Design a protein around this nucleic acid. Structure first.
Ligand code: AGS
Ligand code: MG
Length: 1173
DNA sequence: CTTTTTTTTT
């Protein structure tokens, strides 16, 4: 019988425990956030304080306060749904330890000497918390009575194979032998759980819906903990990040928490380590054949229609542009035919193409691959011509098909949300977006006959249940992604190819920002929450720019209060605590004697390693160093009399697979144990599985009931963060070496932490993915593009690394390339600081603490430069000891990031401008493309220099060391990867206001009123965000010349009309004067300089204009120049001729560059020329 | 030249 909430009626909710400074840090920031933003808006609050200061105890006390607030709210409401609280972390052990810590807090919390909650209140509060493990673990913890009750209650017993499967599972349960049986039991438990829940859900969705209550309800709630969430019995969930990204099950469907994040509270512990976890999920997506997908979309969108019912209101207007695009794409690329390759170098190896989707494009083909349609053969052939043919490239087709596919998935998201709006105002049970999502997708795909995209629609919603590439939007790798396309022959046939494409549509930082934008309030708890790496942490410069004030910050008063709290509870210096740090090299001569004593019947230790320990010849140069620093640390710890607890953090786990090595290590320990008269217990293979099966409490039990030393062998992946290695202290076994460092004792029990640590250098710091080859390729390209996006890599180095990655470089060559970045050193120092923070859990410390660190870490630790006010005592001592050698000359990270980000922004601008011009030079043009081109021109004219970091045209500007001007070198029509900027080029072209001659131009009497009326800037602000060289040379000066010419001509009574999109961008604008039947076009330039306007180009422009518009006149005028030069008259072939026959009039200048005086003579000549037509 | 373990569904 459930506990009623009416037991909290007499509870006094206004009596609360004393809030610590950490509690005030969370509460004041969240209350202020609600004051500033809305009540429904999301937030992200990182809490980057010292390790061991008590940030999980504070997160669980904040969760308990949220549960009490919810109980109070529903007590007064005596309908509002429960607000969901999530506790997420990477490791299962930290999930179960935090749940047991919250339950312990509920059990034995005290207020003024009396328990805060009665036993019935405690049982209700505990009933509000659930834990959601993997499906095999969920099934294996259900007793036979529960599962037989579930099978009986759903009439699932008599269904053939299901009972056959269940009878097998219970059999394996009864005789659970050594782990050999257990791996099989786990695999079959997970498969049976999936099948059973699938049939339970299909039974609950149909008309034969079973009524759940009493025993049946308690059993199904035991089998399905998410059924408690769906009912409303519980609203607190403890789970991992993988489970949170996958979702859980109830009796109806699978609940995805990412689709229902509005109003939720997420507590993410060790948030930085979740960056890689989310990444490993994004790389699991399934590849899609783009040729089949686009041919299916074209075939089914041709005629199929939606219903004209109210529930499908204004959904077809979402899909009409996609239908027009599909019909145009299929006409252009001849999608009636299939695709095949031909020629050499195309059959031996498949073709691989990589695209950033903005400006990084790498092809595995030596020559550019073309695409031609053979109407006699009825085939599309991927040729390699041995002779730029812009029309008919394979990369153009692949990019346009990826654009169309992502357009279809985006319009599916838009139409599902529109369906849910139509339903909520029509259907008038689950009336939310998450509950209507499956029916909306099913109805739309069934109506369009596109049910084969159903899985694709679901996963795209899974990745993008929280939600462009235009130089007018904010651009970033984190919301666009990357794409990897493989073109290979179809499996089974020898005459067709397919384009399997794998996409990353967002980065982990984009997912986190989408989560905050959806309305979630997220508490990010980690000491390394603000590490300066983008591989082992989120990009917080991107998150700061995107979230704005939703990224809650902590004032210096609050940080000083937290620092005072930490230094008050960790007073090492006043209490006589001394910690010694040793940087241990490789002592081969010391390992030679120990190896000789181990097996004294052999002469050469090479034979001992090669035969007994099982180490080959490729090793024995590496193993002899990590099995020598480890032994020197263990010997130095055993020689220490007072120290009792040692932890050794390596990169590899010492388990049965390395049993022979353990035999050597155990022998060495026993040799030392008898020499110094101490008892030593060694714990090997302490990994996640050992923690689930055996449990870390055994180590603590050993330290509590037995005297002697203990050495533990774990890794960074198991004990690096979150783990709370503690043991109960009995003064009889601890001697007299323990002392309290807190000024005021704050602990009920007596506990101590590790007193000796050995820290290896972390090794495999570039992330990898063993799921498949495609997943590892996506993870490597994501890490290269994140390093290019941050600024740690120049665009040419990232392009070269992406080319070597497409060519198939080795993991050791990726690791070599990553070791040259400062990201690697910030990741190394983040891992070291987190690992060293495992020895600072309690206030009962040994008088001496021994730290033994790999000597191959000293130079890295020597380059710490952050504020030491946030470090812990062990990390401050590690840094001070490594720094004791002094300071080494290093390059400032900000100056190199500025050089890289200037190169990046300039290359992005060049590629985007070229693609914009290509789209403009296409018949017919587009309204959006013209609008975007105009928006760029007006923005650069109005704001040629901005003060704050731009949020819409961020790629038009670079940040310079000078103010309002900078120097550069590079060919504007050459390689974007060869540009140099700032101080690297002391002599080079300048991007400055005076170089543009703006002041001389505006001195004209007609320029100022036109500029001021239009709002354009007449001067350059002195700010550090200046235009890139491409924007300055190509776009800004052209618009400035065109605007000056139009201003003076309009002052001379010239009316202007918009150029039609058929011939857009080919000429500046129209010309109408006094009324002439013949059309007149105008082309305007800023100054004379050099112009790629040879006779062939002019003839092409005239032919393309006169073809669709007949004969016409043409004016070609330079805005600035010498008025002494004579006005010219040239024919259509740019040849001097008589005025009576010439079709083109040329004006050398319209505004003088010496006094800014208008050319009245030129206007009079133009008047006479026009009147003489 | 570098030198792995971790969660989940399948
Ligand atoms: N004010 C407090 N009262 C009682 N116990 C506390 C208090 N603060 C912390 N503790 C306990 O002391 C230890 C501090 O550990 P946590 O609170 O887990 O540390 P942390 O600061 O979160 O460090 P992390 O998670 O490794 S980076 C835990 O065992 C807490 O349960
Ligand atoms: Mg924690």
């Amino acid at each position: 019988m459930n506990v009623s909430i009416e037991e909290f009626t007499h509870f006094d909710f206004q009596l609360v425990p004393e809030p610590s400074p950490l509690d005030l840090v969370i509460t004041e920031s969240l209350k202020n956030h609600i004051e500033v933003n809305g009540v429904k808006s999301g937030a992200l609050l990182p809490l980057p304080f010292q390790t061991g200061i008590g940030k999980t105890y504070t997160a669980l006390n904040f969760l308990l306060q949220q549960m009490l607030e919810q109980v109070r709210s529903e007590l007064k409401e005596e309908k509002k749904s429960k607000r969901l609280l999530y506790y997420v972390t990477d490791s299962v052990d930290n999930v179960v330890s935090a749940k047991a810590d919250l339950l312990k807090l509920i059990e034995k919390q005290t207020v003024k000497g009396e328990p805060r909650f009665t036993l019935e209140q405690q049982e209700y509060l505990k009933a509000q918390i659930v834990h959601l493990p993997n499906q095999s673990e969920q099934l294996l913890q259900c007793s036979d009575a529960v599962l037989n009750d579930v099978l009986i209650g759903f009439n699932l017993n008599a269904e053939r194979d299901v009972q056959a499967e269940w009878s097998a599972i219970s059999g394996l349960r009864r005789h659970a032998s050594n782990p050999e049986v257990k791996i099989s039991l786990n695999r079959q438990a997970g498969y049976f759980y999936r099948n059973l829940i699938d049939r339970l859900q299909k039974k609950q969705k149909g008309a034969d819906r079973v009524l759940l209550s009493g025993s049946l309800l308690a059993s199904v709630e035991t089998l399905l903990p998410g059924e408690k969430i769906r009912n409303g019995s519980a609203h607190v969930a403890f789970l991992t990040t993988s489970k949170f990204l996958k979702g859980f099950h109830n009796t109806r469907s699978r609940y995805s928490p990412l689709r229902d994040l509005s109003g939720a509270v997420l507590i993410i512990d060790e948030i930085d380590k979740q960056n890689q976890v989310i990444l490993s999920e994004l790389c699991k997506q399934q590849a899609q054949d783009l040729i089949w997908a686009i041919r299916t979309l074209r075939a089914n969108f041709r005629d199929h229609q939606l219903e004209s019912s109210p529930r499908y209101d204004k959904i077809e207007d979402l899909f009409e542009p996609l239908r027009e695009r599909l019909e145009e794409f299929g006409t252009n690329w001849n999608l009636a035919f299939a695709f095949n390759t031909e020629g050499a170098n195309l059959n031996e190896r498949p073709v691989r193409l990589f695209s950033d989707r903005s400006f990084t494009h790498v092809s595995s083909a030596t020559h550019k691959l073309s695409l031609k349609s053979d109407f006699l053969r009825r085939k599309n052939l991927i040729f390699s011509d041995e002779k730029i043919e812009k029309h008919g490239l394979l990369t153009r087709f692949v990019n346009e098909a990826d654009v169309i596919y992502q357009w279809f998935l985006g319009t599916m998201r838009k139409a599902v949300f529109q369906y849910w709006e139509n339903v909520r105002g029509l259907e008038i049970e689950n009336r939310s977006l998450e509950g209507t999502f499956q029916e909306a997708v099913q109805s739309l795909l069934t109506h369009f006959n596109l049910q084969e995209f159903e899985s694709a629609v679901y996963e795209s919603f899974d990745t993008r249940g929280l939600r462009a590439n235009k130089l007018s939007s904010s651009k970033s790798y984190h919301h666009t992604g990357l794409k990897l396309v493989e073109v290979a022959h179809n499996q089974g046939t020898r005459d067709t190819v397919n384009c399997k494409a794998s996409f990353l549509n967002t980065s982990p930082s984009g997912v986190l920002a989408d989560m905050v934008d959806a309305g979630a309030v997220i508490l990010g708890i980690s000491a390394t929450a603000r590490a300066d790496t983008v591989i082992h942490n989120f990009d917080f410069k991107y998150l700061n720019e995107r979230l704005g004030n939703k990224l809650l910050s902590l004032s210096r008063e609050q940080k000083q209060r937290v620092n005072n709290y930490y230094h008050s509870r960790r007073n090492y210096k006043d209490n006589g605590v001394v910690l010694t740090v040793k940087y241990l090299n490789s002592r081969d001569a010391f390992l030679d004697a120990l190896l000789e004593e181990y097996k004294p019947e052999a002469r050469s230790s090479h034979f001992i390693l090669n035969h007994y320990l099982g180490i080959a010849e490729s090793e024995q140069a590496f193993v002899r160093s990590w099995l020598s620093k480890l032994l020197a640390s263990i010997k130095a710890f055993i020689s220490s009399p007072d120290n009792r607890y040692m932890l050794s953090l390596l990169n590899r786990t010492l388990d049965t697979t390395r049993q022979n090595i353990n035999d050597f290590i155990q022998f060495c320990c026993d040799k030392w144990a008898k020499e110094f008269n101490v008892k030593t217990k060694t714990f090997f293979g302490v990994n996640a599985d050992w923690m689930r099966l055996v449990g870390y409490d055994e180590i603590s039990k050993h330290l509590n009931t037995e005297l002697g030393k203990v050495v533990v062998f774990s890794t960074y992946a198991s004990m690096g963060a979150g783990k709370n290695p503690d043991y109960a202290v009995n003064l009889a076994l601890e001697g007299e070496s323990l002392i309290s460092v807190a000024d005021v004792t704050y602990s009920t029990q007596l506990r101590s932490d590790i007193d000796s640590i050995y820290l290896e250098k972390p090794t495999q710091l570039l992330l990898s993915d063993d799921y498949s080859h495609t997943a590892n390729q996506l993870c490597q390209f994501h890490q290269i593009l994140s390093l290019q996006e941050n600024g740690e890599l120049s665009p040419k180095s990232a392009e070269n690394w992406c080319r070597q990655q497409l060519m198939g470089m080795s993991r050791e060559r990726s690791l070599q390339q990553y070791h040259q970045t400062s990201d690697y050193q910030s990741a190394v120092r983040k891992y070291i600081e987190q690992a060293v923070g495992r020895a600072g859990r309690t206030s009962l410390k040994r008088k001496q603490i021994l730290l033994f660190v790999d000597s191959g870490l000293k130079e890295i630790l020597a380059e710490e430069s952050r504020d030491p006010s946030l470090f812990s005592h062990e990390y401050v001592a590690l840094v001070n000891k490594a720094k004791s050698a002094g300071k080494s000359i290093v390059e400032d990270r900000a100056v190199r990031r500025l050089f890289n980000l200037a190169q990046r922004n300039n290359k992005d601008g060049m590629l985007s401008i070229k693609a914009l011009v290509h789209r403009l030079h296409n018949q017919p043009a587009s309204k959006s493309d013209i609008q975007e081109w105009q928006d760029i021109r007006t923005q650069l004219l109005r704001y040629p220099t901005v003060a704050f970091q731009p949020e819409r045209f961020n790629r038009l500007y670079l940040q310079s060391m000078t103010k309002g001007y900078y120097r550069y070198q590079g060919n504007l029509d050459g390689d974007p990867n060869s540009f140099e900027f700032f101080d690297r080029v002391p002599y080079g072209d300048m991007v400055s206001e005076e170089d543009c001659s703006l002041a001389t131009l505006v001195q004209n009497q007609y320029v100022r009123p036109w500029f001021e009326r239009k709002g354009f800037a007449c001067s350059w602000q002195k700010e550090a965000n200046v235009m890139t060289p491409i924007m300055f040379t190509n776009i800004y000066k052209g618009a400035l010349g065109e605007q000056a010419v139009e201003a003076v001509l309009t002052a001379f009574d010239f009316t202007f009309e918009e150029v039609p999109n058929s011939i857009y961008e080919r000429f500046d604008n129209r010309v109408i004067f006094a009324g002439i039947e013949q059309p007149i076009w105008l082309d305007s330039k800023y100054w004379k300089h050099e112009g790629n306007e040879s006779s062939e180009g002019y003839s092409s422009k005239i032919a393309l204009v006169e073809e669709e518009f007949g004969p016409s006149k043409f004016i070609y005028v330079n805005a600035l120049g010498d008025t002494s030069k004579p006005i010219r008259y040239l024919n259509s072939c740019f040849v001097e001729t008589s005025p009576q026959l010439a079709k083109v009039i040329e004006i050398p200048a319209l505004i003088d560059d010496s006094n800014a005086d208008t050319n009245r003579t030129a206007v009079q000549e133009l008047i006479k020329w026009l009147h003489h037509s």
